[PDB]
Each structure stands twice: as C-alpha cells, then as structure tokens.
Amino acid sequence: TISAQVIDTIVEWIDDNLHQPLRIDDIARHAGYSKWHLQRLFLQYKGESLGRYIRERKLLLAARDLRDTDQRVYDICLKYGFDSQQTFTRVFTRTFNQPPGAYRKE
DNA sequence: AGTTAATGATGATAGCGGGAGTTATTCTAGTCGCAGGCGACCATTTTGTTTTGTCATTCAGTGCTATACCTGA
C-alpha cells in the first residue's frame, strides 16, 4: 500500500485511456494522486522518467499494429499517442535505430 | 342539256383479364491488292503520399520548505 493504492489504478488508467498524452496536469487530477503521489512511485517502482516510459509503452503497443498489416502508417502513431509523425519517427530512430518501413515489412 | 336513284370496291369497327416456356430457323452468295485509324502495350512527366534534416517553445527529476495525522510526554 503506497499512497492508498495508486499502483492498482495507474495501470488501469493507462490501459483504459485513449491516445491522449500523459502529463503532470493531465494525470494527477482524477488519478487520486498528487505530483508527489506519482514522483515517489516513478522513483521507486519504475526508476525512469515519464517521457521515456510512455514512449516505450507506445512503441511496445505499436509493435503489434505494425505487424497487423495496416496500410495507413500515418494513423498508427496517432491512434496510440504520438500527435505528430516526426516525433514518432525520431523516437523510433533513437530507440531501435531502424527505419519505420524496415520494421513494418517484418 | 344536265340531275336523282343505283352500283363493284376499298375503308373500317367488332372484350376486360392474365398465361406460358426454353428461346425458333436460315435465302448461298470469291478472292487479291494497297492504304489509314485504332486497340493494346509500354515509357515518361506530373501529382499525391512517405521519410528525413535543421532552427526554437516546453516537462521530468533532484532537493528543500510547508502542512496534517499518529504516537508520546
């Protein structure tokens, strides 16, 4: 029990939320937690910044949609959180060091 | 001289309703030559869709100060 069961709610919010980005103001409101409700969790249970963890989660979620043989490549990053194509391209290039088409063909 | 009764013919009408099935069957008639337009195939340029590079506006975490509930003197 950390801050009255915030771990059991963060995962549910991440799984049920839409492609809306997750920031301090967005998440803290109806999350049941303060900025400090989440800082201690991100420091202890995860030990990683939010901008990197959210990007990794989006990449792991899109790894299946890229294999689902979808022709609308521009909408894949949009349906999962990336509001722009260039941001998703840079994130994928810095993470996997591979072009988007090279991983989409696989 | 010119006017009323009378003759063969084309001209033309003769029912509202629904009921069905695959589609019926050919008149006999040649070939040889040159020349223009088009169906079809493919290459190329224009435009839409995709990936990549070069400049600023912003949000995490580290750490301290501030406030409230629990255990204690």
Exp. method:
cryo-EM
Residue A89: CB less than 7 A from any atom in strand B: yes
Q: Give the integer Cα–Cα distance in Å for A45 and A19.
A: 24
Q: Quick check: A20 CB within 7 A of strand B?
A: no
Distances (CA, A) of A70 to A29, A41, A85: 35, 36, 16
Residue in the block written with tokens 């959210």: A54
Cβ contact A40 with chain B strand, < 7 A: no
Judge whether A42 and A50 are in contact, CB under 8 Å: yes
Which bases of strand B have any atom within 7 Å of the beta carbon of a protein residue?
49-54, 59-63
